[PDB]
Amino acid sequence: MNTVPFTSAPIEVTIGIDQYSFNVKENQPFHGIKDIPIGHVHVIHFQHADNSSMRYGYWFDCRMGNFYIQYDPKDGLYKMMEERDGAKFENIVHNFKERQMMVSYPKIDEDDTWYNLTEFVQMDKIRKIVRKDENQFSYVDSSMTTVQENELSDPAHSLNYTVINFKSREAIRPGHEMEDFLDKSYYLNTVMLQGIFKNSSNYFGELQFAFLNAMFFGNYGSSLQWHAMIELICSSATVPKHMLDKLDEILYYQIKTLPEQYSDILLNERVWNICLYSSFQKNSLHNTEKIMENKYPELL
Amino acid sequence: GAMNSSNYAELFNNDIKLFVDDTNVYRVTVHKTFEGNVATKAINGCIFTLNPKTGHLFLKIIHTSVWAGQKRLSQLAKWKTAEEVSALVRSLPKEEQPKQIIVTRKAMLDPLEVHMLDFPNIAIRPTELRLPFSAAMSIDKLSDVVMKATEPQMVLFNIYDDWLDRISSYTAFSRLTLLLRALKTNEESAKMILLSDPTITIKSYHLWPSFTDEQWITIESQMRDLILTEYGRKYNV
Numbered sequence: 103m104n105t106v107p108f109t110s111a112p113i114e115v116t117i118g119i120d121q122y123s124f125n126v127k128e129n130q131p132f133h134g135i136k137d138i139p140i141g142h143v144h145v146i147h148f149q150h151a152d153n154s155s156m157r158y159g160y161w162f163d164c165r166m167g168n169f170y171i172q173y174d175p176k177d178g179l180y181k182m183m184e185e186r187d188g189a190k191f192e193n194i195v196h197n198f199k200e201r202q203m204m205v206s207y208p209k210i211d212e213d214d215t216w217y218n219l220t221e222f223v224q225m226d227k228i229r230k231i232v233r234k235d236e237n238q239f240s241y242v243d244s245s246m247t248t249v250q251e252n253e254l255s256d257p258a259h260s261l262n263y264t265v266i267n268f269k270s271r272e273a274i275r276p277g278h279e280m281e282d283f284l285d286k287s288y289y290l291n292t293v294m295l296q297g298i299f300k301n302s303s304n305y306f307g308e309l310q311f312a313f314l315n316a317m318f319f320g321n322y323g324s325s326l327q328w329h330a331m332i333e334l335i336c337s338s339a340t341v342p343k344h345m346l347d348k349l350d351e352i353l354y355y356q357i358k359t360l361p362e363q364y365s366d367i368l369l370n371e372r373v374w375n376i377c378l379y380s381s382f383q384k385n386s387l388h389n390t391e392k393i394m395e396n397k398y399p400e401l402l
Numbered sequence: 403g404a405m406n407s408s409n410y411a412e413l414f415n416n417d418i419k420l421f422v423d424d425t426n427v428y429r430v431t432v433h434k435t436f437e438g439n440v441a442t443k444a445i446n447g448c449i450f451t452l453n454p455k456t457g458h459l460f461l462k463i464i465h466t467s468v469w470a471g472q473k474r475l476s477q478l479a480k481w482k483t484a485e486e487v488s489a490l491v492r493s494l495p496k497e498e499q500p501k502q503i504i505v506t507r508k509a510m511l512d513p514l515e516v517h518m519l520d521f522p523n524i525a526i527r528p529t530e531l532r533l534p535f536s537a538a539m540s541i542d543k544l545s546d547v548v549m550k551a552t553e554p555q556m557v558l559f560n561i562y563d564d565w566l567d568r569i570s571s572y573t574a575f576s577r578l579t580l581l582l583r584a585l586k587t588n589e590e591s592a593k594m595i596l597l598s599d600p601t602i603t604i605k606s607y608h609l610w611p612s613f614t615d616e617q618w619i620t621i622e623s624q625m626r627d628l629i630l631t632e633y634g635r636k637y638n639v
């Protein structure tokens with residue numbers, strides 16, 4: 103079990119760690135988060151009490167280094183940093199643990215929620231979507247735009263999700279216009295899975311990461327990406343059975359975790375009604391259809 | 403964006419544009435079967451592709467053999483239309499290709515957009531005008547060439563005859579849409595108006611009669627009377 107210590111907490115802030123959150127007061131003696139489960143990516147995220155504008159945060163994996171949080175009064179945010187001196191870091195953490203100035207990652211033993219939301223998410227793939235190669239962790243915030251959003255403006259600060267566009271030459275084979283537009287199987291299976299993502303695990307990993315950025319930061323372009331990747335599968339008549347079964351599980355846990363009060367802005371009515379009731383896969387997402395109907399019947 | 407009453411004169415500027423109407427592409431007669439069920443029989447149709455500035459009409463005849471063995475024909479018809487419009491554009495020299503294509507029905511937007519991906523600089527636009535191009539098969543010479551076709555065929559016409567020698571495009575389009583609106587509202591009456599006086603003939607190379615300027619005013623008045631009438635006969639006013 104790993105630890106992300108905090109130098110201090112000079113400004114009042116709500117801190118998130120994965121799907122959990124807690125309030126820290128101005129200059130409260132808070133010095134980090136312990137008992138973080140090894141084996142998963144994690145995200146530590148922030149919303150200042152004075153400016154709910156810009157939720158921001160850091161994706162990381164404690165197997166890749168010793169990370170800590172420090173407040174920068176010039177740039178005005180909590181920054182993740184990496185400590186190369188492993189002895190200094192063990193010494194800093196033990197001191198914090200003995201004075202009991204850390205919150206414990208509060209996982210219920212029965213609870214597989216975080217695993218189910220990050221099953222296919224890998225830190226190495228996050229770092230290709232979020233390009234900043236000098237760090238082992240990745241910053242995301244509410245305002246960052248995606249590569250595709252920029253085509254329709256600072257490139258260093260963009261989310262490089264895979265571009266999906268249903269009315270594009272990449273999606274539509276010359277001579278198969280009607281066929282490829284109404285059944286997107288060649289775009290899903292040949293262009294995207296075989297060509298770009300290489301396997302369904304990498305596709306699901308990007309889909310899961312897009313959802314989590316939409317949920318935790320309200321990142322609009324991430325929400326667009328999540329829905330596009332769902333729609334590309336549901337609009338394909340020919341999808342491997344194991345992919346459909348896994349998609350049903352992925353979406354079930356995403357819909358289960360979504361805050362009940364954010365469904366209006368994070369769920370696209372058109373996509374969900376098409377996917378559950380009109381698409382080729384209208385009958386292949388039983389768990390997802392059941393939770394959607396019981397939790398968000400208004401949207402449908 | 404969408405074409406409406408507010409940007410109407412855009413149709414007659416010097417940017418090449420085409421209207422595409424797909425109403426008459428997939429045409430059927432509905433009938434009873436010996437068992438007393440209902441079936442359709444397709445008949446030949448046509449794509450109506452019109453340059454409103456010059457009057458040039460590219461009439462692509464859709465022969466019933468294109469539907470043989472196909473399913474969901476009303477959906478296929480929109481994609482066949484887009485295929486044929488795209489093939490027409492590719493067949494034209496670059497300087498004759500349109501800068502915009504205006505579809506008369508919004509369901510043509512995605513089919514045409516997808517078939518025209520190779521032409522990103524050609525704008526595909528809907529319209530809020532309720533144009534009467536479905537009545538094109540009430541023009542006898544157009545109906546005749548469609549019904550006689552035994553294979554796919556493109557036939558070229560000027561739907562304004564020689565009117566542009568005497569009037570502007572704007573006025574010619576207004577005459578055309580008045581004629582077609584009348585033909586659509588009451589085909590029998592409209593056609594009586596157009597031919598009542600046998601001394602006015604249709605030239606072999608024309609679609610409409612050879613009216614003098616003064617006779618077109620009388621004709622046009624009679625078409626307005628018909629349309630307003632039918633509008634009464636319909637709603638009782």
Ligand SMILES: CCOC(=O)c1ccc(F)c([N+](=O)[O-])c1
Pocket residue numbers: 107108109110169170171185191194
């Ligand atoms: C360059 C000075 O370094 C620090 O101040 C430091 C480094 C690592 C670390 F974990 C912590 N801490 O408070 O959690 C602090």
